[PDB]
């Protein structure tokens, strides 16, 4: 199953609310786990089941499901959130991911 992400990159200032989309080609239920990778650091779990927060993740992260349209919403952006965001469905990873950097 092909999985797509958009936008490829985005810049937001401190404290803004931003969202990232992850579109799936077929019905995947809610199995769209999210992962964030800080530059030069191994990726770690953000959201599992597409709406459940991983342990240690602040409540400021939120995920939701609109049919086959999936969103990860970020509130009150903070500097440590800079990096890349990946959404996983089964064995498929979105090509390129989404890069988030400070404005």
């Amino acid at each position: 199953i092909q999985v797509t992400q958009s936008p490829s990159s985005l810049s937001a200032s401190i404290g803004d609310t931003i969202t990232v989309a992850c579109e799936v080609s077929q019905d995947v239920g809610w199995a769209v786990n999210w992962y964030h990778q800080r530059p030069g650091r191994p990726p770690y779990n953000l959201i599992y089941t597409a709406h459940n927060l991983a342990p240690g993740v602040a409540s400021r992260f939120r995920g939701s499901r609109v049919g086959t349209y999936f969103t990860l919403t970020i509130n009150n952006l903070l500097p440590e959130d800079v990096g890349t965001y990946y959404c996983q469905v089964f064995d498929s990873f979105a090509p390129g991911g989404t890069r988030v950097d400070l404005r």
Binding site: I1, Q2, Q26, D27, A31, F90, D91, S92
Partner: protein, 441 residues
């Protein structure tokens, strides 16, 4: 005007989890003698107008029965001899008399010092161990493969590993719902629900790739999987017709009893009378081809008509998963099923599967304890039915329609769930309240 009236014994049930006791119709590893004697005539009641949701995966019965089988397996070895003295340096020489081309090095003639009845006295004896049980130490010096990871207790030779059908009966106040739909894929509503006091004959067969002696589908070969899209959940296949499989151990094995202590006997493997050949399982080529044709015809539906379906052998892993392992008359086989899953499909003869024997068996992958299956005297041979498949799909490149399916298994819950698939456990709730024109006095 209106008032409420309390009812007793209303036909109302809720999904619930409870303990199920066994009933069954020589000692056995599964304590069938401990099962209550089932009624000669089971009672089955058809529930017309009823539509109940079913789900093998979220069913408790599979987990409960996995626990039950593991408990029985553990209990059957407690009053059995512990082979701790066998962990001694071995002197093994290859057996090379009257052996065939494929028997070069599969059996080892190991001689070792062993404790006799008298503690101070010792004794030198010899035994025949298959190559998979002994590992070289770096004639040469060998040891049992268990010796650095676990301690084995010899399976008591008098208990039979043969599967006896056992029925799991819910206590009073609970009911078992049996889905009568012949096209029921295992998830979603089952329009035809019939209740029974408890299950039909369930044989807890122990197999990995091919499901032996199982229950057949009534109409067509069916494909059952939690999320077919997810290329990880095993695809449970159930055959509408049986595929007979024959296989035997041609060696005329002899059981030699070696006393290793007070009342403790270790049953070794003596010299084989006659030539030594390969254990090999036979499957009819035409019957297997027809069954594969039916399977691929029913599989195309879930995917597409124009897609290419190709069966390849197991990718890799431990011996149990890579091969087709199953106990046959007290012996544990490991059959190299590469000639079965080999064809590629586009929109009298028998297949010989070379099997390998193992005596040090570690089922359930328990940390610290393993089993030594005593050798079976004579030539063992069993005729079983291939009644299912456990296929694992491989993720494609999203560019080709060549869906590749390989045998899986290992997780015995998958093997067992093809038998408890049509059943469900419900809790009777006989108190009901409804409005009626009645009034208390």
């Amino acid at each position: 005007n209106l008032w409420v009236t309390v009812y007793y014994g209303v036909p109302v049930w809720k999904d619930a989890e409870t303990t199920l006791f066994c009933a069954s119709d020589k000692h056995n590893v599964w304590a069938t003698h401990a099962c209550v004697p089932t009624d000669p005539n089971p009672q089955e009641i058809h529930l017309e107008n009823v539509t109940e949701e079913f789900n093998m995966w979220k069913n408790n019965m599979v987990e409960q029965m996995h626990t039950d089988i593991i408990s029985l397996w553990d209990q059957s070895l407690k009053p059995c001899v512990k082979l701790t003295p066998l962990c001694v340096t071995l002197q093994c020489t290859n057996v090379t008399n009257n052996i065939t081309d494929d028997m070069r090095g599969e059996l080892k003639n190991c001689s070792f010092n062993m404790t006799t009845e008298l503690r101070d006295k010792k004794q030198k004896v010899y035994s025949l161990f298959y190559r998979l049980d002994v590992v070289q130490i770096n004639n040469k010096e060998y040891r049992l493969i268990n010796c650095n990871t676990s301690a084995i207790t010899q399976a008591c030779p008098k208990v039979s590993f043969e599967p006896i059908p056992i029925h799991y009966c819910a206590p009073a106040g609970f009911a078992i719902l049996k889905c009568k739909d012949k096209k029921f894929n295992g998830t979603g509503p089952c329009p035809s629900v019939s209740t029974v006091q408890c299950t039909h004959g369930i044989k807890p067969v122990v197999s990995t790739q091919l499901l032996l002696n199982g229950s057949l589908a009534e109409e067509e070969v069916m494909i059952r999987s939690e999320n077919i899209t997810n290329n990880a959940k095993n695809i449970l296949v159930q055959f509408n017709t049986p595929v007979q499989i024959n296989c035997t151990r041609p060696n005329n094995n002899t059981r030699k009893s070696i006393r290793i202590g007070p009342g403790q006997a270790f049953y070794a493997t003596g010299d084989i009378i006659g030539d030594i050949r390969q254990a090999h399982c036979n499957v009819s080529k035409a019957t297997w081809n027809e069954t594969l044709g039916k399977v691929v015809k029913q599989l195309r539906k879930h995917f597409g008509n124009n897609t290419i379906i190709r069966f390849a052998n197991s990718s890799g892993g431990d011996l149990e998963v890579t091969t087709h392992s199953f106990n046959c008359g007290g012996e544990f086989f490991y059959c190299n099923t590469s000639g079965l899953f080999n064809s590629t499909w586009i929109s009298n003869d028998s297949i010989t599967l070379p099997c390998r024997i193992k005596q040090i068996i570690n089922m359930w992958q328990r940390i610290g304890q393993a089993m030594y299956a005593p050798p079976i005297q004579g030539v063992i041979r069993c005729v079983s039915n291939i009644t299912g498949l456990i296929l694992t799909r491989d993720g494609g490149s999203t560019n080709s329609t060549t869906e590749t399916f390989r045998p899986g298994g290992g997780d015995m819950r998958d093997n067992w769930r093809s038998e408890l698939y049509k059943y469900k456990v419900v809790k009777i709730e006989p108190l009901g309240v409804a409005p009626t024109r009645c009034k208390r006095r």
